[PDB]
Design a protein around this nucleic acid. Structure first.
Ligand SMILES: [Mg+2]
Ligand SMILES: [Mg+2]
Ligand SMILES: [Mg+2]
Ligand SMILES: [Mg+2]
Ligand SMILES: [Mg+2]
Ligand SMILES: [Mg+2]
Lengths: 199, 109, 190, 352, 138
RNA sequence: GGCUGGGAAGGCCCGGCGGGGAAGGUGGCUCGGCCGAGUGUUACAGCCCCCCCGGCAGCAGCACUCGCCGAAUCCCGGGGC
RNA sequence: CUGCGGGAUGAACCGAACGCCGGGUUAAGGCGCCCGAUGCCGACGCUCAUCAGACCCCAGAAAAGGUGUUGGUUGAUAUAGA
RNA sequence: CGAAGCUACCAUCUGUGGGAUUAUGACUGAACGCCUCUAAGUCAGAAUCCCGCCCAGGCGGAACGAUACGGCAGCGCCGCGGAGCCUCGGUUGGCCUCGGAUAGCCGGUCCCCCGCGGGGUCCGGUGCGGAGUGCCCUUCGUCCUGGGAAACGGGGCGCGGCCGGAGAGGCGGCCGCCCCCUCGCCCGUCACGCACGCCGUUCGUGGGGAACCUGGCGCUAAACCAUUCGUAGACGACCUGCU
């Protein structure tokens, strides 16, 4: 009953608008791997935009001024918050349902994560256009834990490779076992393929 | 023995940008995302079920804490599967983005 | 507008064996093996004919800007084939008026130190790209030879050692000193 | 309008949370970077500011007018009795930070270390670590400790050791020991963990980690000076004698259009007792404490190859407001932050 | 690496539009994203059809680029495009989708029972094979 | 119902006239097993297309939905609020 | 002396003028999220900006340049070989 | 004249490293058979920007110690039971590769290499994805006996061992022993308040928070005030000592 989305290959605003709309409808949304987010335009454009945002601060007291979060997950969180009525109680309650993470944390490392084709770079962006990765942008503006995240993601990918190898073995054995006892399930298979299955 | 109502979400009231009409609610039925599948749900009874501190009567059962506000599907709302509904009493606005069950027995098929 | 079809072919010699991993050309031959990934170019990389005699590149519905990639990929493949067959040798001469330029290779040819450039006490240690080996040329009083398979790395190392010897805060037209590339050829001419 | 004559601002904006320090013991914000090639060692120590004195030394700087010339330089004495290892702490890297993984203490804990665990030692029943020590004397507890060490070896990447000072050997009034984590830098994680486990319930002399003519960092809290005016706190210009409403002030607090006083404007408040970290403090001499083989051995404190006397670093009548230095001491060039009896953290240089 | 081309006589499948889910053959190319199309054996007249709404299969019949609707029909009949298309996996999957769409509640109950028995039999066989494989490994 | 008394289209086509793409053909060359595929040149039609002479029910703004205006040249039924 | 919908904001702008309500439909404006509605399998082209651009009043720019790119006009020469 | 304490460039000590790049200079290379730092790609690059060092530390977390024996008391884990107040969301789950888009998925791998598995060559099947989220998994009436197909599966918060999992693990996997049941698919065979048409039915839930009734296994305080000290201080606060 909770949406888990993989942030790799998704555009910032395109995914943020959809996530905010779903969150306002009472849906619980989890966004994972926020370093895979990419933004349209060359890297220098987005670097300059984030530096210009960094310049924004209260002259009399920067502590009370804007909070420039450097983590990619917090950057995505702020972009989503910009698309919500966060000043109202309803907006805050909706924003409480949102949850973002750098990398893929252990609570969600063993879950299937969905992707939104309406926010993917391969779909929404021309192949000849340039883009910038959110992880590299964050690392060059103050982020500290890019290498640790990369190492943990490599370990997680190795574990996922082991699990996927086991799944391949299980599926291959399942397919062979179906062939072994195909004579005892012929009547069950015929009715399945009569109504539009296994075809 | 199972669920006999479709899931819907109280998206909000009928409104413009700066004016809100609380006598008509907007419903988001799950699985309907076009202004062509909403014809089935037209006229369907809808209820908002909630619980409260004090006990109330219950048809065919002992008194419980559950109270409901009954409603009716009126018309579709703008090409996206949104449905306008009218209730005997306006919704409390606390149920924004909460579950509203639309029944299946104003049957006409 | 959009050109319906633009294509160009490269005729490789029988010595060179070329393969493509979708859009990554791997070229191997006598001198070694060269790899170059041709992604982010969006062209149809076709290898037609027995013995892989010819390599064809295609571009469908491309504008003026996307059209030059067809020629540039062919040029890169030609350079790679030339490097894997004959190689690239860059000869550069050190030019000076009063102070002679003392150039010494340090490890094998990778680390090059330049001494007594305009009398400067500072010594420049310049590292070259992997796969390129520098040496002190013979039969010439002051010349360096840069050899390698990839033209890009050899030329980049030559540019690095050209820019290492630069005169500051003086008339560069009068003070014509430094090491400049004099010849761009191949290790073996055949 | 622009100011008529330009002048650099008073004070540093990089030092101005000007609040009384929350901590009394100096804190190491960042330990030296760990490389797994050099042998295992500690990188921190705790000393006490004893006093200050002179020194005579020939200079060996060619080209200077002072080359091969004797000079008088101020040196500060920091008494450093050996510390006792009582436990180790492990850390694991996280995309959110570096959280502690597991802490294991020793079977025996001195009363001095237990002093830190109680705010009122007189009223306390001294029950701390009563059930914990049962682990070290039971098979189930030993197995649990072995599993803890194995888990720390497998998962942790940063290892720090808990050590406390021996306040019994100091002449100070207080008896509560100072406990601090010291990061172990050296070989692999397993080697560092095993070396730390061996050093459990053992004394570590200062001479092991620090050597002569070595640049170190001193960390501590500044002398407290209470509420001070803007003239003393920020060293602003004094208004002339004709000033009516006080001349030890700042005349223009701010401009009109920004209807607030900025955080960069100098104002009165707390001065002193600030946490500071000085750099490039040179160890002129590492002294050997009082030891007895036949009688007292007091010469080594202040005897040199040219004096060969029986002097000690303690002046006549002892150090003023501190006492007598008996244990090992470290001599640092120049001055250090803090008053007498102030606990000082000695840290290795973070730079080559 | 392209195996599908917009060639004169290429058979195309219409994804969406008025003639959705009907085969059609390309006659001539009108523009970059528009071509003249003709569907005589699939109840499609000759009119322009954009490339967006058509996905072309691997059937190509040969006829001149501007034939008058008569020779293309003859080539379609000689090549027997309908039978070849019905033999393909693509049409079988489309028919499976349609059968799923038209399945009634009684048929859904029958399918539920059939799957209930079949999955249990298959998973019992899979468990036995897993035990045999573990025995072989040891 | 009207229109260009709709424009094209569909089927059997018959007796002709010319023109153009450039093909079961020829052919310099290229790629594979006489054939298959790709380019050019004069170029009739056994791949076709277009105009002129003329005639058949097969039509109908056609559920092969290729684009109109419509209603004493217009009526019936059903669903929701 | 005048409320209402839109122009984020608002004297005069656009639409439209006022009793209390239910249903339906519009104007001017809009339909990624804030925010009601394109969550159309919208159509044809143009544009890369390390100062992009984004809707009367209106909240900002000129002369002069660019083989950056996309169309048009005129003029020559090229198998007697540019 | 002057102790101690404060104090003066009026004495003395200390003041640091990387990354991305701007301008600029370049490499390869077309557009434009030539040339070109630019179009694709690449290099060097600074009182620039960011970070490190440094200062403060989130209505932000972590590990560890003791956890009220009393003269009345009060707790912490386990299981299985009763009412008794408040607060709500819900109305089967999916336990997972990396990934590219002018390409990808699955096996055998006759062949080779590397640590049952991984990598490469070749071969064979699909690709508007049927090893499809346009998807998969489970049935959502009960019980009697009376047949066929399939079959040793499941349960008693079943009891004891071996592990994986540390990013914020908070979940699962693998083995031993007792008892009980004949569960899934097709048909016979009846019986289940059949409450005589009328709405919040059907669950995650033994839900979460607070107060009271059963037992088994472990507990014995610390904080603050008061006093004391000055490394502290306007007062609070802070560093300390006291069977
Ligand atoms: Mg309920
Ligand atoms: Mg000035
Ligand atoms: Mg006066
Ligand atoms: Mg740099
Ligand atoms: Mg660079
Ligand atoms: Mg440049």
């Amino acid at each position: 009953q909770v949406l888990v989305l993989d942030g790799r290959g998704h555009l910032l605003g395109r995914l943020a608008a959809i996530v905010a709309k779903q969150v306002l409808l009472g849906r619980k949304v989890v966004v994972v791997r926020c370093e895979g987010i990419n933004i349209s335009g060359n890297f220098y454009r987005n670097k300059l935009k984030y530096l210009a945002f960094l310049r924004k601060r209260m002259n009399t007291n920067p502590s009370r001024g804007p909070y420039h979060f450097r983590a990619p997950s917090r950057i995505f969180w702020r972009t989503v918050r910009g698309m919500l009525p966060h000043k109202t109680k309803r907006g805050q309650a909706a924003l409480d349902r949102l949850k973002v993470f750098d990398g893929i944390p252990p609570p969600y490392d063993k879950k299937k994560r969905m992707v939104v084709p309406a926010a993917l770079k391969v779909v929404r962006l021309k192949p000849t256009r340039k883009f910038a990765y959110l992880g590299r942008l964050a690392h060059e503006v103050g982020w500290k834990y890019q290498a640790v995240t990369a190492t943990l993601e490599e370990k997680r990918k190795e574990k996922a490779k082991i699990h996927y190898r086991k799944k391949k073995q299980l599926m291959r054995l399942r397919k062979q076992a179906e062939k072994n006892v195909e004579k005892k399930i012929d009547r069950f298979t015929e009715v399945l393929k009569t109504h539009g299955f296994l075809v | 023995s199972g669920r006999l109502w479709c899931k819907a979400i109280f998206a909000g009231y009928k409104r413009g940008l700066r004016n809100q009409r609380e006598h008509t609610a907007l419903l988001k039925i799950e699985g309907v995302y076009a202004r062509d599948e909403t014809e089935f749900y037209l006229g369907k009874r809808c209820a908002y079920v909630y619980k409260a501190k004090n006990n109330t009567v219950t048809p065919g059962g002992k008194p419980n804490k559950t109270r409901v506000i009954w409603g009716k599907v009126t018309r579709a709302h703008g090409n996206s599967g949104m449905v306008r509904a009218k209730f005997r009493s306006n919704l409390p606005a606390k149920a924004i983005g909460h579950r509203i069950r639309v029944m299946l027995y104003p049957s006409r098929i | 507008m959009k050109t319906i079809l633009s294509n160009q072919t490269v005729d490789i010699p029988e010595n060179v064996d070329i393969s493509l991993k979708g859009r990554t050309v791997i070229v191997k031959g006598p001198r070694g093996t060269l790899r170059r990934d041709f992604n982010h170019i969006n062209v149809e990389l076709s290898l037609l004919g027995k013995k892989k005699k010819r390599l064809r590149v295609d571009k469908w519905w491309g504008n003026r800007k996307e059209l030059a990639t067809v020629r540039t990929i062919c040029s890169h493949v030609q350079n790679m084939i030339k490097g894997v067959t004959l190689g690239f040798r860059y000869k550069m001469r050190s030019v000076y008026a009063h102070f002679p330029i003392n150039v010494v290779i340090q490890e094998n040819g990778s680390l090059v130190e330049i001494r007594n450039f305009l009398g400067e006490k500072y010594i420049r240690r310049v590292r070259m790209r992997p796969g390129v080996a520098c040496s002190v040329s013979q039969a010439q009083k002051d010349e360096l030879v840069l050899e390698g398979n990839d033209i890009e790395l050899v030329s980049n190392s030559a540019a690095l050692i050209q820019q290492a010897t630069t005169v500051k805060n003086k008339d560069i037209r009068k003070f014509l000193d430094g090491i400049y590339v004099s010849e761009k050829g191949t290790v073996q001419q055949a | 309008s622009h100011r008529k004559f330009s002048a650099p601002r008073h004070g540093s904006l990089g030092f101005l949370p000007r609040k009384r320090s929350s901590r009394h013991r100096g804190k190491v914000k960042s330990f030296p970077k760990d490389d797994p090639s050099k042998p295992v060692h500690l990188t921190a120590f705790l000393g006490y500011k004893a006093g200050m004195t002179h020194i005579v030394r020939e200079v060996d700087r060619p080209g200077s007018k002072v080359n091969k010339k004797e000079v008088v330089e101020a040196v500060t004495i920091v008494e450093t009795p050996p510390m006792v290892v009582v436990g180790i702490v492990g850390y694991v890297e996280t995309p959110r930070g570096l959280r502690t993984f597991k802490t294991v203490f020793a079977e025996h804990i001195s009363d001095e270390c237990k002093r830190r665990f109680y705010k009122n030692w007189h009223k306390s029943k001294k029950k701390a670590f009563t059930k914990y020590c049962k682990k070290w004397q039971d098979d189930a507890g030993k197995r649990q400790l072995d599993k803890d060490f194995s888990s720390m070896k497998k998962y942790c990447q940063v290892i720090r050791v808990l050590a406390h000072t021996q306040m019994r050997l100091l002449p100070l009034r207080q008896k509560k020991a100072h406990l601090m984590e010291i990061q172990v830098n050296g070989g692999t994680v397993a080697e560092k963990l095993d070396w730390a486990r061996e050093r459990l319930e053992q004394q570590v002399p200062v001479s092991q980690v620090f050597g002569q003519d070595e640049m170190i960092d001193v960390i501590g809290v500044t002398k407290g000076k209470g509420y001070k005016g803007v003239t003393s706190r920020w060293h602003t210009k004094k208004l002339p004698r004709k000033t009516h409403r006080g001349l030890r002030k700042v005349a223009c607090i701010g401009a009109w259009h920004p209807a607030r006083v900025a955080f960069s404007v100098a104002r009165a408040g707390q001065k002193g007792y600030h946490h500071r970290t000085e750099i490039n403090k040179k160890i002129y001499k590492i002294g050997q404490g009082y030891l007895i083989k036949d009688g007292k051995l007091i010469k080594n404190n202040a005897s040199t190859d040219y004096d060969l006397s029986d002097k000690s670093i303690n002046p006549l009548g002892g150090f003023v407001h501190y006492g007598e230095v008996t244990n090992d001491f470290v001599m640092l060039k120049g001055c250090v932050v803090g008053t007498k009896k102030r606990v000082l953290t000695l840290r290795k240089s973070l730079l080559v | 690496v392209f195996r599908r081309f917009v060639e004169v006589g290429r058979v195309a499948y219409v994804s969406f539009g008025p003639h959705a889910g009907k085969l059609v053959a390309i006659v001539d190319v009108i523009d970059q994203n528009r071509a003249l199309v003709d569907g005589p054996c699939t109840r499609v007249r000759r009119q322009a059809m954009p490339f967006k709404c058509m996905q072309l299969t691997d059937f190509i019949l040969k006829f001149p680029h501007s034939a008058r609707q008569k020779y293309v029909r003859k080539a379609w009949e000689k090549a027997d495009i309908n039978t070849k298309w019905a033999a393909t996996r693509w049409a079988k999957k489309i028919e499976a989708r349609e059968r799923k769409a038209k399945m009634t509640d009684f048929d859904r109950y029958k399918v539920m029972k059939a799957k209930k028995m079949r999955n249990r039999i298959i998973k019992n066989e899979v468990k036995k094979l897993q035990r045999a494989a573990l025995l072989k490994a040891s």
